[PDB]
Amino acid sequence: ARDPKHDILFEPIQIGPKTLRNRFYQVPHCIGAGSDKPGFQSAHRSVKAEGGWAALNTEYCSINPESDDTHRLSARIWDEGDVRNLKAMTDEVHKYGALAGVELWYGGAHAPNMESRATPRGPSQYASEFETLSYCKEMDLSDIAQVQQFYVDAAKRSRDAGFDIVYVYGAHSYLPLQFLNPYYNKRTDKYGGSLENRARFWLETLEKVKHAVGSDCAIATRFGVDTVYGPGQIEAEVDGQKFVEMADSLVDMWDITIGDIAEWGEDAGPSRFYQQGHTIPWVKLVKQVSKKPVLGVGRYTDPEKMIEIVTKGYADIIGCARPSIADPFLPQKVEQGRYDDIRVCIGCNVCISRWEIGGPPMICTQNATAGEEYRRGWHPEKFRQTKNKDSVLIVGAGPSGSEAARVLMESGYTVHLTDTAEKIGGHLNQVAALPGLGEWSYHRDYRETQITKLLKKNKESQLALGQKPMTADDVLQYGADKVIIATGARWNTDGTNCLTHDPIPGADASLPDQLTPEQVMDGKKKIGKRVVILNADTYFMAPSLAEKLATAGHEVTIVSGVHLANYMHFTLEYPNMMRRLHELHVEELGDHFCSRIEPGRMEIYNIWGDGSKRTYRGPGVSPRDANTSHRWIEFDSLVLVTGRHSECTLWNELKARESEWAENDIKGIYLIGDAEAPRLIADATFTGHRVAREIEEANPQIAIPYKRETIAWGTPHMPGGNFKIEYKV
Amino acid sequence: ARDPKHDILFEPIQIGPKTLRNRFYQVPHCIGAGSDKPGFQSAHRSVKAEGGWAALNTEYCSINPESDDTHRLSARIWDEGDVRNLKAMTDEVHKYGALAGVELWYGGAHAPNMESRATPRGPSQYASEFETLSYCKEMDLSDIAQVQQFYVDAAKRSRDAGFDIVYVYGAHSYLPLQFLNPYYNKRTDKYGGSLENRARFWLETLEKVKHAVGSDCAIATRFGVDTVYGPGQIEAEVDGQKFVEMADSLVDMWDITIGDIAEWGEDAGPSRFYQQGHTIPWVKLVKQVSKKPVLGVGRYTDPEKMIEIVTKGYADIIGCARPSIADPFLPQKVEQGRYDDIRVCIGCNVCISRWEIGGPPMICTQNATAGEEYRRGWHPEKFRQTKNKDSVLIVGAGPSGSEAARVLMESGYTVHLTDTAEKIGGHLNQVAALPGLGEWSYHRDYRETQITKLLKKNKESQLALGQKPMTADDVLQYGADKVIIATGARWNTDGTNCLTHDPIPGADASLPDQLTPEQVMDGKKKIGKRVVILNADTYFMAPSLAEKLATAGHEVTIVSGVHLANYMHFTLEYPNMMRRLHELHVEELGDHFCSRIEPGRMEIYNIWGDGSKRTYRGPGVSPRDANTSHRWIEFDSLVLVTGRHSECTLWNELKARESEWAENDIKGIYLIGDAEAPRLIADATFTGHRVAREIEEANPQIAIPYKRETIAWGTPHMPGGNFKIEYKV
Ligand SMILES: Cc1cc2nc3c(=O)[nH]c(=O)nc-3n(C[C@H](O)[C@H](O)[C@H](O)COP(=O)(O)O)c2cc1C
Ligand SMILES: Cc1cc2nc3c(=O)[nH]c(=O)nc-3n(C[C@H](O)[C@H](O)[C@H](O)COP(=O)(O)O)c2cc1C
Ligand SMILES: Nc1ncnc2c1ncn2[C@@H]1O[C@H](COP(=O)(O)OP(=O)(O)O)[C@@H](O)[C@H]1O
Ligand SMILES: Nc1ncnc2c1ncn2[C@@H]1O[C@H](COP(=O)(O)OP(=O)(O)O)[C@@H](O)[C@H]1O
Ligand code: SF4
Ligand code: SF4
After folding, report:
1. CB-hemisphere CA count at 13 Å for A138?
2. Ligand 1 center to residue A29 CA distance, Å?
3. For binding ADP, which residues are annotated in this chain's numbering (chains A, B)?
4. With an 8 Å Cβ cutoff, are A137 and B718 in contact?
5. What class has domain B492-643?
6. Fewer CB atoms near the end CB (10 Å): N or C, chain B?
């Protein structure tokens, strides 16, 4: 079944003392587990091992508590307690015949150290451009020797934990790169100035780590070969290549990236800006000068692209982070020729966003089991089979409905999925037509393909699209045992918003000079020259519409009561988005909202317009002086992006008539997705996945408990430590 | 020794079936521990129990997974794993004869549920004004019964964990208050409309909880009596007093607050805006209509104010959160008449800022042991006494040096503290003179009072202020065994900033039209009419300086290459700070920085002015189109607020001459505080505290490990559960 052209992907490659079983490599990446959630870490990486990935790597792994990333979650290899938690992972990926790697990390001032409160050290004292209140101490020669010893000690504990590959991590502008890069390194001693001096710290660390564990472990390094800032930081054909020549003999394998830390969306390229293989112009520069295996991520999901870069001599190994999150069995599907079962990463970066927010576990828009493998026992490729003949009617074929259909069908149920829309995908069909978001299609392409394939396996299963809207009676009299309502949400038409929770006087999207997103995207309702987009949403909709409208020749002003595109900080889209709105001359009026709308004009006010002093003036009167900042602005068309509401009128009717359910042999009706409450596409598809996994539980409407990975009082993290309160007195 | 006037404070008061041993009450408050850090929770509350606080409450405690505050950290009472972990705290506070309380919490859409992924429910569907992407499902009567049962179950688990006081939490606009408040509740049935219908959810929940555990536990309710938004939300003389009259027979004690969730800085009132007793005008109103014990927080630190609100009949009990964080032993000190040993909270809200950031443990600017009680065994009031007669010279009497001196003197060392300054307190003496920051003085007032006190305990110790600056020779010949350099930081004079890490061409604070923060605060140098403040710092200096100058009749523009006053989001100062700048007509030009400065004018650019498309154009040329936004703006004076640098010249010289230490019998020299790296006042204070505690360690420059509270792989959180991966197949 496998096209023999793909056979190269399954040749083994020696990395130092080790052998990769094939050319599929999961580069180090955060998942929100670290050494704190050992089951999560263990399960998420081991399912990938059984899925065929040659090597699995932890995320950035702190070598010492003065590189503590709290509030974000890194791995830590500080002590014996970590060695045991991390070993859970290496044992479990070894079980399925894969290598395990750890990415040794020291952050410099980029690590805020909010747990440890320790002082970070660096080449020169600087305030981090990422963590702008975090400063570091300039290292003296002893600081340098001590921190190099941190690396050696961590490498040894890594061998103890059972790791096969040990990185010294100099990508994303972390310590080794801070020495190499003059942007940080202002020294004038033997560690500063010339390339040879600036390369010195990394070189010395490499051979010290190699000396400590090089016999048992492959020594890899992760290198940001170009900071993509131009002259002034690392350029690939200046320092980048010359450094690779210097260090080549010490490293068993090169793992290449581009970009810095403040803008690491240049590495993890959103599909909004970057296509698969976006990194190739920089990555290939390395294989030019290296004599060792190199790999370089580039959101590779397509085996034709994978074989192109290997045979064209751009890379030897296929490095993946996100592709491996979206589909842990990518390599097995390619090997077996099941190319149409490949769940393709859509480059949305919602997995990243959870880490960036600092704390929460990762989630994935494509793969609703990511982060759920251990806590709820959900294997992405294995499904409990039903022992009964229950049919299920799903009304709504959007992200949630289509996912519930797919999982149910995989579990052997008989399902009837219906929609008024002619195509599976729900609102995602409109969203993927926004400028830049075309690859978000892959979400609904995947369920379409899977659902049509699965239909052939149960002939009682039906797909009824292009339908007439289901009614309460239609549902009651349909004869399904269970019904899942996945009818979605729409954008508010009356100015209702998270700020007031009330409509705005004069807001009415049926008026000729007011549009909703849906009206804009259907492209029928005419839009005048001067557009104002009123915004109370912090994600993609208002910026995407602004771009769309400005490139169509409108003059667009966003007046935004919330921080525009805030969530796009976390997905890493923010910087290029702002640059994009800027070059399109989109005017932004932040910290303003709307008190009333008339034809062709609206009254706006500053949200900080009230008196700063609070005085008790009794009931009936505000405790602050009045907001006096109101002014009118004109528009030709007003686009309302104020919030969404659940489309649950069908559900409500069905619930009203719950008495009749039993009469009609309906065992239960459940509400999922945006029809329950508007949410991220990722979580909409999760709800469909969850009710499908749990449809035989007592109440599939509410999730059953998941395994919790929190400390049990009475059990010390330190092997053989004392857990009780002891004062140093 | 205790003033007889203060005898009331130590009278017992009966709340339901329970008796408070005195009038000091720690209301529920976050600490970044929850049920995840059982030592931290246990240690922090019990040192307060031992300090004489009558009752100690957890922070907000989730009753169910669908009210999950991740990425922030709440307590949880979901299962038996939690009652084990939380029982650790109640056992320890019981050890000291105090009551333990728990605050049962359901948040509605305000809880983003980033761990559980569950769906919140509320009175109506709204997007949270606090979590703008978080929506809830509108409850039906079945949902309503199901959620009220969550409370009952949590209250029974609480009783099992050994809690004496069980709250139904209706403050900070959480679920019970959402039903009562028309801002959220747009219902039309018997849970909406009239006050009777609106108070229905809370009354029902109080009755069921009472019925469940009211026999064994006092039943309290924490109520936001006025949303301080005026008409449209809860007003104290309208709905507030009425609801109190309705619920009065169900509750054993009223715990009263004001304000909402988006702006609970109105509750936790910063000293920048509010004084001790600021809440009284609202709190006293509940006392008018209630027959139960009432307490209402108001940053109460002064026993004179405490007896005032009790004797005037505003409150029966003294409820404190921050005062108890800054001084766990406030009750004992008042009891014993040690009034001048009280470590007064400065109302800086840095403790809060850590919880708001989401994840990190609490820290306190006054009390360097808050958060460190369990992990490093630091009791705020007990110090290990030295066995030797070592003498320590400390140069610098700022937050770090004065804390090192204080703790060293407490431990029995001979210390010589010296500064060129006339007063103890370092840079905090300038900072406390910024508009609104006068109470930040208490940090140096406290340390001045304690050092003066400790000097009498040891004749050889010495405070020398107003001195010549210490010189490397001075230190070497001084005759101290160990030396601590605590010489601070200063604001940059050359435009060096976190964005570029380099000077700005033309930046020179020696020129007559450029000022630093110190020069403005000294007030000697002349400032012209039009002032531009160039900002690259995300905390208080720029907005405070802007306030100061604007009030003095200057025209102020802040051009800010970072998010202005970003950190004040977390300290809760931001809303009222922005209103203040607004009424002072301060112009803010965000998303801009400065390429170069000339006399009377500076060139600024948009930080998003580079082209959005990245293309490899080879070395020497930027991969983005050039920023073209540069324009010149004029000023009469330019205030530079771009960053700070360590003042470590003395340190550097001493390290250069390390070979001379031994012959001068200097056993060690240590660098602490801002001189090591610029930091928050809280952490400057901590570094001094830490070297003092660890001065006999092998290397006092670097902290020794603290106890970690992370799960140990192999130990299930669920008592009797399985920790191994198990897939449901
Ligand atoms: C959720 C997430 C977290 C990441 N954290 C890390 C990390 O800990 N260490 C690291 O070296 N890179 C980190 N990365 C970057 C990836 O290793 C990788 O370079 C990026 O995802 C681009 O590769 P892709 O296009 O194959 O996803 C992270 C990426 C993701 C998806
Ligand atoms: C660090 C911190 C976290 C807080 N979290 C809570 C909480 O979980 N529950 C609650 O009801 N109030 C919370 N608050 C508010 C306090 O209970 C209190 O009402 C507020 O700080 C004002 O009281 P004070 O002036 O005595 O500090 C918190 C306050 C602080 C200081
Ligand atoms: N009564 C109905 N009958 C059939 N399909 C319906 C009905 N009401 C809504 N739908 C469909 O439900 C789907 C909901 O999709 P979507 O909004 O994407 O929600 P989600 O994100 O929850 O999957 C839409 O394709 C819509 O056409
Ligand atoms: N050479 C010196 N001799 C004596 N005192 C000094 C010397 N250099 C600086 N100082 C003092 O050190 C103190 C530093 O305090 P501060 O800046 O508040 O630092 P921190 O916040 O680290 O405590 C200042 O009061 C300063 O006058
Ligand atoms: S969350 Fe989005 S970007 Fe991340 S792996 Fe999943 S589909 Fe890809
Ligand atoms: S951190 Fe600040 S506001 Fe909080 S308890 Fe301490 S001194 Fe008070």
Report:
1. 20
2. 4
3. 400, 419-420, 427, 470, 674
4. no
5. alpha beta
6. N
